[PDB]
Amino acid sequence: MRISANFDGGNIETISLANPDDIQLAIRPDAGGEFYQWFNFRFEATIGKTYTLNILNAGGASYLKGWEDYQAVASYDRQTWFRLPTEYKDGKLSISVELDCEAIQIAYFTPYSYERHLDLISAVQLHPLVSTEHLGLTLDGRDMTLVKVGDDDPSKKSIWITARQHPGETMAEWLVEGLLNQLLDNDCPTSKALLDKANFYIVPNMNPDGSVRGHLRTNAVGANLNREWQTPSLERSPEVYYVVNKMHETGVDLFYDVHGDEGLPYVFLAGCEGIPNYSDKLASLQQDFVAALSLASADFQTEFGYDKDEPGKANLTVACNWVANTFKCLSNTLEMPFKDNANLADPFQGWSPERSVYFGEASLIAMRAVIDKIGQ
Amino acid sequence: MRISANFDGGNIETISLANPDDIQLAIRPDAGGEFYQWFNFRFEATIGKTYTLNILNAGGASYLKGWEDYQAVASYDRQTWFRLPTEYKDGKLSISVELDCEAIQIAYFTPYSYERHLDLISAVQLHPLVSTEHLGLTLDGRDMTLVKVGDDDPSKKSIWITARQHPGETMAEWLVEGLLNQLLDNDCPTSKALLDKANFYIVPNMNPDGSVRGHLRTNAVGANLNREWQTPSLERSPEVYYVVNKMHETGVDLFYDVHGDEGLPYVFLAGCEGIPNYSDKLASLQQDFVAALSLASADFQTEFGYDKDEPGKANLTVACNWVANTFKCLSNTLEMPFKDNANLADPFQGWSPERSVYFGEASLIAMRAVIDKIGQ
Amino acid sequence: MRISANFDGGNIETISLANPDDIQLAIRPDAGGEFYQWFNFRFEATIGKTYTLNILNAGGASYLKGWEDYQAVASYDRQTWFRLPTEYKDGKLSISVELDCEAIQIAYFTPYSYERHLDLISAVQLHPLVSTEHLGLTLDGRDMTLVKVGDDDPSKKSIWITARQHPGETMAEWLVEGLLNQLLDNDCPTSKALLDKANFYIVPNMNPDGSVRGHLRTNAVGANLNREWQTPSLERSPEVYYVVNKMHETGVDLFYDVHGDEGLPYVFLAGCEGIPNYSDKLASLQQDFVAALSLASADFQTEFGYDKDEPGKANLTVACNWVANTFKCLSNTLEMPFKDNANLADPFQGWSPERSVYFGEASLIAMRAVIDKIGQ
Amino acid sequence: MRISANFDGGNIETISLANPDDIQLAIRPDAGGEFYQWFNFRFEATIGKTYTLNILNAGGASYLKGWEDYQAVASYDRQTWFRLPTEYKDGKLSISVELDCEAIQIAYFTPYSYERHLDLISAVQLHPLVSTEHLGLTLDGRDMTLVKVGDDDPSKKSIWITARQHPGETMAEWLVEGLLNQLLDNDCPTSKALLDKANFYIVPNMNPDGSVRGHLRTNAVGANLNREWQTPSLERSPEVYYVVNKMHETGVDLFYDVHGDEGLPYVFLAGCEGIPNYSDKLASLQQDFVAALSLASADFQTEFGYDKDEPGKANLTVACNWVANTFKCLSNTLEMPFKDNANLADPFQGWSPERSVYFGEASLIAMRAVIDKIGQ
Ligand SMILES: [Ca+2]
Ligand SMILES: [Ca+2]
Ligand SMILES: [Ca+2]
Ligand SMILES: [Ca+2]
């Protein structure tokens, strides 16, 4: 029996490997010690036995609702990631592994490596309408890379799409890969139509450091990038600092910040209704966008989500709000579940990279729906 | 220099191969002599020369608007089909071939073989929710095959999708392949949602005989299958006869007859407003369907199309009308262009199998939009 | 219960579909009535039941040993082909089919349609060292296409590879497909080494008409092409006529005639030792070539095959002898089994396209082994 | 202008990005400071301009002949890797880069990341004859994974294949990738023939720590693993320690140690003729094996390589000698070039992963050639 986590995005501590029926494990907290929930490790043992893996400190994780009805994600081949029988009792998350192969990787969601990220931002370069741009360095010295899709025609609209501010929400980068694959297909009319009218500025990974470090919610020094938008710094939140400045060069006509929510088994938008600069026009663009997104995706819904902000009561340090209020534009945070969409449940895989990719495609349709309405 | 057409879907007659600057060719009429326009042949010559291929009887084709601004489709590898410089003057369609390889296939649209059809209806079988059904024989003795997708739960709605009644409109089968590939993907929520609520009855090729025979508009004996719907026969229109009877077993809650239009460079729906049984409900389902389809596809439009029928003035021998009137359901004919979509023009390839496939996907979204509204 | 053979390569006649425990069929003879063995048909019935299909005229097939230990080939998806439980007694070949899907295709070997042929000879054109050449028409008016691989440097050695003189021997064209794929990959050193020294003249299908017609062994007018090499004609055997004349333009340094054998469950070469121009030099090349092939491929063997010809007693109407005798060169007929390689049995699929593809690859290694020894 | 190496396998130090005509860099030494040559970095600048990149400490690299006629490897998409114009004078290696895309990755050979390693050893698990076995941890805490191919029948012969003891020699793991793919294809007869007679013990990466760290030649603590075979330890060389102990459990009948050579532009084997247990029998197997390899692969040659050891004078701390001497078996070191195969030059890419994959395939043929001759 073996457990391991020394690789890109790994996160587990081994407490005890003595008992096959009680393998004891712990999640390692994000830097700064204030958050955790993401785990990602590899387990090797004799096949044909059923093992119980106990994450002892699940009860100390940042979002305990996220453990309720949750099933761990696992893969034998690192290609197909499926769900495992999981339960949460006495502060511990118990995972049953009926090992069909010697080696299995188990994680909070399907991982997305820095090697994969590098392949994605390198490959999109070949497209004639694509140019990548080095925004700057992360605190560990990794690259903040901007994918610009379009012909930089100043008359076109500006669409900003940021994903993975919270590194453990890997479904965010997965969606951005799906969306890029569809946008970069000229045979797709939505893509052609969009690119005829807009330039895209896309950041597939807002937080490479937290990503490689196996953090749930913070960068290298423990900053929550989604509170850094109003007063970002090079010292603490360079990741947001460069994005914010670029936005000032480009303008923003539509903003889509892609996230993952631990506790709620639904896909939902959370808008910026509480910003001081909210308006009837913005209200109206939101209704149109939500209308379009519901038609575009059967995974989308509007019953469950976060509470709305009272008027003027928005937290202007949050990307969605800060962008909306600063650039007076349609702006949303998208949340996809770590669990599954309870409305269209899939017990074999729950929410998955495949469904995140489909939501990336549905997203471009919602955008096209409002393309002629956004901007000036 | 050589010209050839003896293969599945081939259609050309060689008048003269004497002059490289004036290769003379003719389209062979459908059986019964009343229609033609489709051509499909192979041409071999010395590379690096530019040849002029003249289809002498273009002026005698069934739809002369279809020659205006039309460019022939061609391929070196039978995978990527592109457009050739083409002109229509003095009743002849002139195609310039700057031969980059020894062998090129040139056709009215991308062909879709019976071998390809057999692969498609064989492959879908592997899906757990798919069963194919032999409806009967065509007049040449080929197979009319029905693809049933779903679990045959009698409480579910019935969706009928028929394509390629007119064999030369190959874009119809191409769309049906795209649509099946998307419908049979469980990761797609639209697919899951649809199949939760409906059973699909799909005929990827209404006219195998006309298809293999290289006809534009008719089956083996020259019948136009889209006038056979009210009084079909085994002797003359077995293809429609078996479909019509099956419909009586299944019911129809939505009908989608997939077609191609020669003269108009637009995608458009043609509905059944002129049926005696038209109603406010049917009017309303049509508006919803059209609304959804416009949001789903940037290739769709609603300005151009056919003229609407005066009330009660529908031709009830046409599938769209006959089905709508008989089963009192949302029913449409879809027309995709042999030219290109003038709104999102693509000079390298015009309308293509790739775009037809995308329209198949957009179609499932339009359907889902009305899934809860159709039926009783 | 339905039986059908109306499609490219189809061959069966239905005697009786009355009894599911005794479906009665017969193999249609080749044009000329002299031969048969090849069959290919589609069967549709009810899944979950086991049907017995009896080819009542198997006892009159051309090679009766071909029936002993033979198992029929089948596919539900037309991509994976596998063996069905088969027995031969009292002149009847009995195939058991427990239908998992409604439709299944059953054949003597995996079919290779003309549409596939067209895809192959078209696709290879894109390679910068490939040119196709139209040799002329078949009797039914289809193409005899020569695939030329190399820089056409007339100083180089000439390698001729011909497959499928007997149409039912589809494995031969599967092998050429595999040989071309590898030969066209420049990262393969054997490929690079060969093209530096030789030009290739490859005919993936010697008998397109026999192929489409579902014949075992003859072209459209009942000619056995492999007895036409000495005195062919445009009116009986144009297929051979054009190749013989091209060989005279190009010369021949190595000849490989790809065939399939019904009776022996082994892979073997048959040489041309009986030709009047046989020489020590030729016998030496043959041993070099056989050794190399034994090393290149574990499926090859040299214990079983055809008896050798006595000195001078070869039939010069057979390609291998005629070529060897005319061009004084290394020349073999390759025979692959319809059954399996008894030495490396595979019950699920027996001999297959994939194994044929691998043997194509091994053939290039054998050829490379004699590349500097051949020619002049 | 940006230079970066913070990623798996990264290696460069930036001296000066002041002048685009003289970008100044240096190669970081391996832990221990004794060796270097491997480099790997990403460069972002402005497209359309030609930049010169000068590695100023090339003159202190471990193998200076490695620089003569060497051309650097690069990629814009991280899928296709090609050679850049390079020269070496006055101790500096000068790379010319005319940037077509903004970002390019430049390396000594095509990188092979640990994430890719994990994909490989995970994917192969799905094969029914493959088991992975965790041998233990590396010094940095990564996995030493043994890939076992076969039915584990202890009566069979034992074939051991080890690659990438020197981390920078990535071609070795590319070769194992290609060898595994082919070995796991049951339609390949050599594969089938081998697994009927042998079990395989394959280590695709002998030095994961050196690999992630961007080392040429040493593990995490500066150890040259290929001098550790006689007296390894858990604390300096656990990588070799676990393999040596496993070999003692399994026995060894054929050993293949996969390496890359900096200096010679050729593929060659280095045997173990200097071992005290050398025998006529071993010399015979070696000639059989060399002959077979010469036949299997046109990239192989036997004129150039390392000088041979005198009788008895081999260094038994080197794997090939230690194994040959300990198990009295056929044993070779394979060396592939960083440059190219001077005998089959390819300017666009020189020696490459794809050629390495092909050589993996050729290696199975060579092994098959001695399969019944080896063992006991
Ligand atoms: Ca988040
Ligand atoms: Ca039509
Ligand atoms: Ca034959
Ligand atoms: Ca080495």
DSSP secondary structure letters along C206-234: S-HHHHHTT-SS--TTS--GGG-SSS--T
Instruction: Select the residue of C298, C346, C369 nearest D190 (Cβ to Cβ).
Output: C298
Closest chain D C-alpha to C193 CA, distance in angstroms = 7
Ligand nearest, relative to CA of residue B226: 2
* H-helix or E-strand spanning residue C250: helix C238-250
H-helix segments, chain B? 114-123, 171-183, 189-197, 208-212, 238-250, 280-296, 319-327, 353-370
How many angstroms separate the alpha carbon of residue C156 from the centre of ligand 3?
29
| Gap between the Cα atoms of A127 and A180, Å rounded | 11
Mutate to test the interface with B, among A197, A294, A344, A352 (most CBs of B within 10 A): A344
C-beta neighbour count of D161 within 10 angstroms? 27
Contact C79 B118 (CB under 8 A): no
List the one residue out of D170, D348, D197, D179 whose CA is nearest residue D256: D179
Contact B118 C77 (CB under 8 A): no
Q: Which residue type occupies A10?
A: G
Closest chain B C-alpha to A13 CA, distance in angstroms = 34
CATH for D2-112, among 2.60.260.20, 2.60.40.3120, 3.40.50.2300, 2.60.40.3080? 2.60.40.3120
Ligand nearest, relative to CA of residue D207: 4
How remote is the C-alpha of A198 from its chain's centroid?
23
Residue A270 — left, alpha, or beta (φ > 0 → left; ψ -120 to 50 → alpha)?
Answer: beta
What count of Cα atoms within 13 Å lies in the side-chain half-sphere of residue B328? 6
Q: Is B168 exposed, middle or buried (0-12, 13-18, 19+ CB in 10 A)?
A: buried
C-alpha distances in angstroms, A288 versus A156, A321, C94? Answer: 20, 19, 65
Mutate to test the interface with C, among D346, D358, D371, D373 (most CBs of C within 10 A): D358
Structural tokens at position C10? 């189809």
What one-character-per-residue DSSP string does B271-322 give? --TTSTT--HHHHHHHHHHHHHHHHH-SSB-SSSSPPPPPTT---TTSHHHH
How does DSSP classify residue D88? E
How was this one solved?
A: X-ray
- Work out whether strand C40-44 and strand A50-55 pair parallel, antiparallel, or are unpaired: unpaired
CB C160 within 8 A of CB C363: no
Could you list which residues have their CB under 5 Å from ion ligand 3? C 166, 169, 259
What residues pair up with C129 in beta bridges, in sequence order?
A: none
All chains having 3 or more CB pairs closer than 8 angstroms to chain B: A, C
How many angstroms separate the alpha carbon of residue B204 from the centre of ligand 2?
14
C-alpha distances in angstroms, B364 versus A355, B188, B189, B371, C11? Answer: 17, 11, 11, 10, 39
Contact A193 B298 (CB under 8 A): yes
Residues contacting residue C322 through CB under 8 Å, at least 6 positions apart: C229, C230, C316
For D186-208, letters b (16+ CB in 10 Å) and e give bbbbbbbbbbebbbbbbbbbbbb
- 3-state secondary structure string across A228-297: CCCCCCCCCCHHHHHHHHHHHHHCCCEEEEEEEECCCCCEEEECCCCCCCCCHHHHHHHHHHHHHHHHHC
Instruction: Select the residue of A190, A358, A365 nearest B187 (Cβ to Cβ).
Output: A358
**B132 chain-C contacts, CB cut-off 8 A:** 44, 101-103
List the one residue out of C365, C321, C362 whose CA is nearest residue C341: C362
Closest chain B C-alpha to C76 CA, distance in angstroms = 6
Instruction: Select the residue of B77, B132, B134 nearest C122 (Cβ to Cβ).
Output: B77
D346 touches chain C (CB under 8 A): yes
Q: Where are the domains of chain A?
A: 2-112, 113-376
The sign of the CA dihedral B343, B345, B351, B357 is negative
B344 touches chain A (CB under 8 A): yes
Structural tokens at position D44? 């972002």
Q: Report how far apart the first and last C-alpha atoms of chain D are (Å, whole number).
A: 62
C289 touches chain D (CB under 8 A): no
For D258-294, letters b (16+ CB in 10 Å) and e give bbbbbbbbbbbbbbbbbbeebeeebeebbebbbebbe
Give the strands of the sheet with A198-203, arranged side by side. Answer: A130-137, A143-149, A198-203, A157-163, A254-261, A330-337, A268-270
CB A58 within 8 A of CB A25: no
Contact A78 D119 (CB under 8 A): yes
B22 touches chain C (CB under 8 A): no
List the one residue out of D155, D147, D153 whose CA is nearest residue D183: D147
Which resolution, in Å, applies to this structure?
2.4
Residues contacting residue C284 through CB under 8 Å, at least 6 positions apart: none
How many residues comprise chain A?
Answer: 376
H-helix segments, A146-188? 171-183
Closest chain A C-alpha to D372 CA, distance in angstroms = 31
Residue C166 assigned as binding residue:
yes
How does DSSP classify residue C293? H
Q: Which residue type occupies C12?
A: I
Residues contacting residue C352 through CB under 8 Å, at least 6 positions apart: C81, C110, C346, D187
Residue C177 assigned as binding residue:
no
| Gap between the Cα atoms of D301 and C364, Å rounded | 19
C7 touches chain B (CB under 8 A): yes
Instruction: Select the residue of C102, C118, C126 nearest B133 (Cβ to Cβ).
Output: C102
For C287-304, letters b (16+ CB in 10 Å) and e give ebbbebbebbbbbbbeee
C-beta neighbour count of B213 within 10 angstroms? 21
**A346 chain-B contacts, CB cut-off 8 A:** 186
Binding residues of B for Ca(2+): 166, 169, 259
Structural tokens at position A355? 């469904």
| Gap between the Cα atoms of D253 and D262, Å rounded | 29
Structural tokens at position D239? 């990588």
How many angstroms separate the alpha carbon of residue C195 from the centre of ligand 3?
28
Mapped onto helix, strand or coil, the DSSP state of residue B105 is strand
CB C94 within 8 A of CB C58: no
Binding residues of B: 166, 169, 259
Q: Which residue type occupies A288?
A: D
Mutate to test the interface with D, among C182, C185, C191, C192 (most CBs of D within 10 A): C192
B touches D (3+ CB pairs < 8 Å)?
no
D52 touches chain A (CB under 8 A): no
- Return the percent helix, strand and coil in chain D, to nearest 5: 30, 25, 45
C372 touches chain B (CB under 8 A): no
Contact A102 D133 (CB under 8 A): yes
H-helix segments, D222-264? 238-250
**B102 chain-C contacts, CB cut-off 8 A:** 125, 131-134
What count of Cα atoms within 13 Å lies in the side-chain half-sphere of residue B188? 19
- Return the percent helix, strand and coil in chain A, to nearest 5: 30, 25, 45
| Gap between the Cα atoms of D49 and D57, Å rounded | 25
- Work out whether strand C254-261 and strand C157-163 pair parallel, antiparallel, or are unpaired: parallel
Mutate to test the interface with A, among D80, D81, D130, D143 (most CBs of A within 10 A): D143
List the one residue out of A113, A160, A171 whose CA is nearest residue A135: A160
Instruction: Select the residue of B292, B341, B358 nearest A188 (Cβ to Cβ).
Output: B358
| Gap between the Cα atoms of C7 and B115, Å rounded | 8
| Gap between the Cα atoms of C188 and D355, Å rounded | 7
C-beta neighbour count of B259 within 10 angstroms? 21
How does DSSP classify residue B28? P
Angle at D216 between CA D214 and CA D220, to 5 degrees: 65
List the one residue out of B373, B257, B110, C187 whose CA is nearest residue D297: C187
Quickly name the fold that domain A113-376 has.
Aminopeptidase (3.40.630)
Structural tokens at position C5? 């053979």
List the one residue out of C34, C47, C42 whose CA is nearest residue C12: C42
How many residues comprise chain D?
Answer: 376
Q: Are C2-112 and C113-376 the same fold in CATH?
A: no
CB B362 within 8 A of CB B348: no
All chains having 3 or more CB pairs closer than 8 angstroms to chain D: A, C
List the one residue out of B333, B332, B334, B330 whose CA is nearest residue B282: B330
* H-helix or E-strand spanning residue B148: strand B143-149
- Return the percent helix, strand and coil in chain C, to nearest 5: 30, 25, 45
Q: Which residue type occupies C138?
A: T
Residues contacting residue B118 through CB under 8 Å, at least 6 positions apart: C7, C78
- Phi and psi angles of residue D52, each rounded to the nearest 5 degrees, phi first: -115, 125
Q: Is D181 exposed, middle or buried (0-12, 13-18, 19+ CB in 10 A)?
A: middle
